[PDB]
Design goal:
- The structure is cut from a larger assembly and holds three copies of chain A (171 residues), two copies of chain B, one copy of chain C (113 residues) and one copy of chain D (127 residues).
- Chain A is mostly helical.
- Helices cover 54% and strands 9% of the residues of chain A.
- In chain A, the strands form two sheets. Chain A has a two-stranded antiparallel ribbon. A two-stranded antiparallel ribbon of chain A has the order 3-4.
- Chain A is rod-shaped, with a radius of gyration of 27 Å.
- Chain A starts with 21 loop residues before the first strand and ends with a helix.
- Helices cover 0% and strands 37% of the residues of chain C.
- In chain C, strand 4 and strand 5 form a beta hairpin.
- By secondary structure, chain D is mainly beta.
- The N and C termini of chain D lie far apart (40 Å).
- The chains are: A mainly alpha (171), B mainly beta (163), C mainly beta (113), D mainly beta (127).
- Chains in contact: A-B, A-C, A-D, A-F, A-G, B-G, C-D, E-F, E-G, F-G.
- Chains E and G meet through helix 2 of E and loops of G.
- The PDB classes it as viral protein/immune system.
């Protein structure tokens, strides 16, 4: 548990439906959502691989569970069920205990995906932006659509806004 | 593979016995009949000759052979049908061998019959022979099933549509 | 980026193939290679979506597949109404679908000059 | 299910246009849309895209900050407001509808565009 | 085979063995043809002796 | 592993007995311990659920392990013993490995809880306090019992102590 | 996923072959690598324990898999086949999923180690060094080999260099 989901970001966004993780920017030009496509695609690939690993790693053979025994062979019968029930027990203890664990793991995975996304932009904005809580930032300068597009892309160009940000922050 | 073939022809192979055994418990469309894959032998004229028949497997497959042994309810029926106080049925093969003797008893009435028929089966290997010898109480084989075993399946006891 | 061939030609009733490849990678089924037909004056039409899936309306002369890390559109028995520009749209982890330059298929109906 | 495009023409450099596309035969509330352009002598280039509910919006890196794609569900219309147009904006513009895909409860952009529009020729100049 | 060895097939013949090694189709078993009753049971019993 | 337990917080506290994670505060009024009830209760709930998931997912049927065979069926005894040995091996391996993995998961859970507590208080105090190690924060102003009670509760009121802190930080 | 490996540290070092996690220092005296021996040794011990737990926990009993049945016992050939197939399926599924999950666990363990090393050096340097990206630091003062050796060892002695760092930072 990394403290990003149900942590410093209390709730999710219903309006951002085309991804799992995203940004919400607010400018003079306007406000808007933008899902992060790369992280969402990587997470989708991971979840798909996990589901396929759970599903397609059980290859069985043609068997016919079920045998007929008369009165004169009860031990025989009592052995057969001891096999059958036994197998069921194992599977019923594995599958039920399997899903649970991966469920937890999945709920950790998404959390990490959010947390890293919060860290990456932090390392990009530095002192040029101030954390206002709720897991997001307020800029010390004027960011147009180009600035926020660059922040989302991964190339903020910190030095260019450094001096105005310094002038506005030292207040 | 599964093929039904005549192990012992009805018209031939039984020249000294009567092959018209018929029971009311096996009634088909009103009148009494018997099984299709078995042949009930009763003494012809007033005597039941000794019988010794043999079948050699040349089907390149294991052949399922089914026969039966008849246990009349009283001694009177035994004398009337097979004319011998005590009878024997010997079935001999390379890996199966068994002797049967009629067990005359007054069993509880089931399907309007008091005597019984005990049904026996064997699997004949390729290139193997089966020998029947009897002086009475033999429900001789008529049709043998030449089959080849496949994968291990089971029997589903259900009443559901087949598609 | 996506690379196609500038122009190709086919005689009527002849089978032709159009290729679509990445400039610096391979094209797999996860790229969902779509094929769009564009006639002049009319909207482009999705001939192929996914690797091989084809819409009902589209004739069955058009089939597609991934062959040799390259998306391919095969037209078996090219009629006279298949003289258009064919564009290949691939999927790269975003809504930004990169398109090919375009391939002008010329169904020959006159002697070459 | 057809899309009809309109609102383009000859505009001076540094001006603005508002291209509009009207869809007849379906509802826009559950489909994602895109605007694509073909420059003269060049291949098809992605311009902008809008999600199913209109919340998410993505722009090409060359037209960011100048283009705004919006959706009006009441009128069944998709608008591309183009501002501060430059000479490189001369093109033929198509409005396309993304095919419906649903991956793990999310709307997709995998299969491409199923319904395109006839297109609108937008030309700018400084002569 | 196990039958031929335990019966004494002329053309054949230790005090402890962990397991038996046999050919896929032995040719010197029961020289006189017949049926060996409970052959699999005897093979299991003789599989390992102390 | 998150680096809190046996990390930048090297040792535990024996005086804090009513919780797993807590605070130690020092004022002019006096020093004292205070366990974080919410995080400790959440951890207790999670651990109880994990133990219950392990224990109560094993639902077996009435069985009688043990058969009697005469010396004329040794194949029977051998098959029964093979079944019993296989079940014992499967269960031994699965149980031992499962306990081994869950122990690591639980320790990582506790480490994550402690690191999230530290991160919460760090984000709350911001530059009004300086980090000194051992998971400790030295304030730049005078925090009475009200101040640290607010820090523990979750409502620090950063602006109210801001300017004074600056006067003591640019010294 | 802790975001260090293939995160803010994009690639590995081919020239650092005597450890898994290390430092690269560049001074006026010269540049060089130095693997962190303590963290590497702890990670090696953990991995060895993991491998041994997987391997040395399969305690099997002497068995002979394989029975001979004639044509008159087909139900038992089938039951024996059922037992064998069931055990094979269980072991295949369990082994495959087990290795699949521990591979993820091991990768996360290495990522956690790298992230913890970076956090330790970050918290040690405080504001005397600038995060220049690529997951590493540039000093605000002149560090000879003693300074870098102290950083690697774990005793940086910040207030010795604080004043010159402030002089060079407030430029």
């Amino acid at each position: 548990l990394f403290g990003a989901i149900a942590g410093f970001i209390e709730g999710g966004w219903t309006g951002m439906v085309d991804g799992w993780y995203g940004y919400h920017h607010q400018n003079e030009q306007g406000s808007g959502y933008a899902a992060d496509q790369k992280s969402t695609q990587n997470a989708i690939n991971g979840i798909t691989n996990k589901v396929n690993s759970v599903i397609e790693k059980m290859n069985t053979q043609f068997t016919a569970v079920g045998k007929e025994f008369n009165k004169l062979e009860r031990r025989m019968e009592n052995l057969n069920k001891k096999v059958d029930d036994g197998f069921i027990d194992i599977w019923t203890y594995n599958a039920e205990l399997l899903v649970l664990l991966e469920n937890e793991r999945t709920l950790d995975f998404h959390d990490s995906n959010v947390k890293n996304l919060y860290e990456k932009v932090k390392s990009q904005l530095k002192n040029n932006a101030k954390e206002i809580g709720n897991g997001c930032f307020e800029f010390y300068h004027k960011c147009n659509d180009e600035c926020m597009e660059s922040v989302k892309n991964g190339t903020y160009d910190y030095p260019k806004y450094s001096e105005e940000s310094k002038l506005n922050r030292e207040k | 593979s599964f093929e039904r073939f005549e192990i012992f022809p009805k018209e031939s192979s039984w020249p000294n016995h009567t092959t018209t055994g018929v029971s009311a418990s096996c009634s088909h469309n009103g009148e009494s009949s018997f099984y299709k894959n078995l042949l009930w032998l009763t003494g012809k004229n007033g005597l039941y000759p000794n019988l010794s028949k043999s079948y050699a497997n040349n089907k390149e497959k294991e052949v399922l052979v089914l026969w039966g042994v008849h246990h009349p309810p009283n001694i009177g029926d035994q004398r009337a049908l097979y004319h011998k106080e005590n009878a024997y049925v010997s079935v001999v093969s390379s890996h199966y061998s068994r002797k049967f003797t009629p067990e005359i008893a007054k069993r509880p009435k089931v399907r309007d019959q008091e005597g019984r028929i005990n049904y026996y089966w064997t699997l004949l290997e390729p290139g193997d022979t089966i020998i029947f010898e009897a002086n009475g109480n033999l429900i001789a084989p008529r049709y043998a099933f030449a089959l080849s075993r496949g994968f291990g399946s089971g029997i589903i006891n259900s009443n559901a549509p087949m598609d | 980026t996506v690379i196609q061939e500038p122009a190709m030609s086919v005689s009527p009733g002849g089978t032709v193939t159009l290729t679509c490849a990445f400039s610096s990678g391979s094209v797999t089924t996860s790229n969902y290679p779509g094929w769009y037909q564009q006639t002049p004056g009319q909207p482009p039409r999705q001939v192929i979506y996914s690797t091989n899936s084809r819409p009902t309306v589209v004739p069955s002369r058009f089939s597609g597949a991934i062959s040799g890390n390259k998306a391919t559109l095969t037209i078996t028995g090219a009629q006279a109404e298949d003289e258009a520009d064919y564009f290949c749209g691939l999927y790269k982890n975003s809504a930004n679908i990169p398109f090919g330059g375009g391939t002008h298929l010329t169904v020959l109906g006159q002697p070459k000059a | 299910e057809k899309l009809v495009e309109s609102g383009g023409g000859l505009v001076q450099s540094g001006g603005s246009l508002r291209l509009s596309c009207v869809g007849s035969g379906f509802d826009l509330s559950d489909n994602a849309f895109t605007w694509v352009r073909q420059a003269p002598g060049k291949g098809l280039e992605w311009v902008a895209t809008i999600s199913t509910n209109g919340g998410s919006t993505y722009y090409a890196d060359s037209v960011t900050g100048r283009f705004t794609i919006s959706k009006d569900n009441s009128r069944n219309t998709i608008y591309l407001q183009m501002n501060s147009l430059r000479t490189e904006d001369t093109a033929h513009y198509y409005c396309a509808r993304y095919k419906v895909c649903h991956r793990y409860g999310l709307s997709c952009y995998y299969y491409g565009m199923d319904r395109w529009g006839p297109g609108v020729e937008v030309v700018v100049s400084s002569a | 085979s196990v039958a031929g060895w335990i019966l004494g097939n002329p053309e054949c013949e230790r005090e402890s063995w962990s397991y038996i090694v046999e050919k896929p189709n032995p040719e010197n078993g029961t020289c006189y043809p017949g049926h060996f009753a409970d052959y699999e049971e005897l093979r299991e019993q003789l599989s390992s002796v102390s």
